[PDB]
Amino acid sequence: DSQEKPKPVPDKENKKLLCRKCKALACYTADVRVIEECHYTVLGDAFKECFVSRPHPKPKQFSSFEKRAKIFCARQNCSHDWGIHVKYKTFEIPVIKIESFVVEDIATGVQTLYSKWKDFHFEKIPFDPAEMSK
Numbered sequence: 001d002s003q004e005k006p007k008p009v010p011d012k013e014n015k016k017l018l019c020r021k022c023k024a025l026a027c028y029t030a031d032v033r034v035i036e037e038c039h040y041t042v043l044g045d046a047f048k049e050c051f052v053s054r055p056h057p058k059p060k061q062f063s064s065f066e067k068r069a070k071i072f073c074a075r076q077n078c079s080h081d082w083g084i085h086v087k088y089k090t091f092e093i094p095v096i097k098i099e100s101f102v103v104e105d106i107a108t109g110v111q112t113l114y115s116k117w118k119d120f121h122f123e124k125i126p127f128d129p130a131e132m133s134k
Contacts, residue, residue, distance in 0.1 A: 009106060018102045020113050021073065021080050026050060026101040033125040035088065039065075039095040040117070043131035050074055051094070053085050065095065090127055 010030035019026040027042040034040050052074045069085035071094050083096035104111035
């Protein structure tokens with residue numbers, strides 16, 4: 001039903017991201033903001049709706065941060081986990097890896113999937129709480 005249409009853009013110098021899973025939009029670099037290059041998170045319900053979070057009777061795990069819930073893709077695939085739900089002194093947001101999704105430019109369409117975070121192509125940006133709420 002004429003669904004093959006172009007998508008809008010957030011701001012200048014913006015790139016789109018896909019999920020290596022089924023190579024489907026995951027988020028946008030324009031929304032992908034790192035907390036002082038410590039963790040990778042996105043803003044907007046766009047990424048909060050693209051994914052999902054489940055409770056489950058689980059205690060906790062010993063690692064950098066503390067996860068009190070799991071997170072998965074909202075897509076049809078249920079056996080496709082991206083990361084988990086963690087909390088930071090700053091705010092409660094999920095933290096994923098760099099080798100979790102690909103980066104497809106909207107001005108090129110070239111999608112790529114890194115391995116290490118050291119292979120970052122972004123910069124440190126402060127997590128605006130204004131984006132969190134309405």
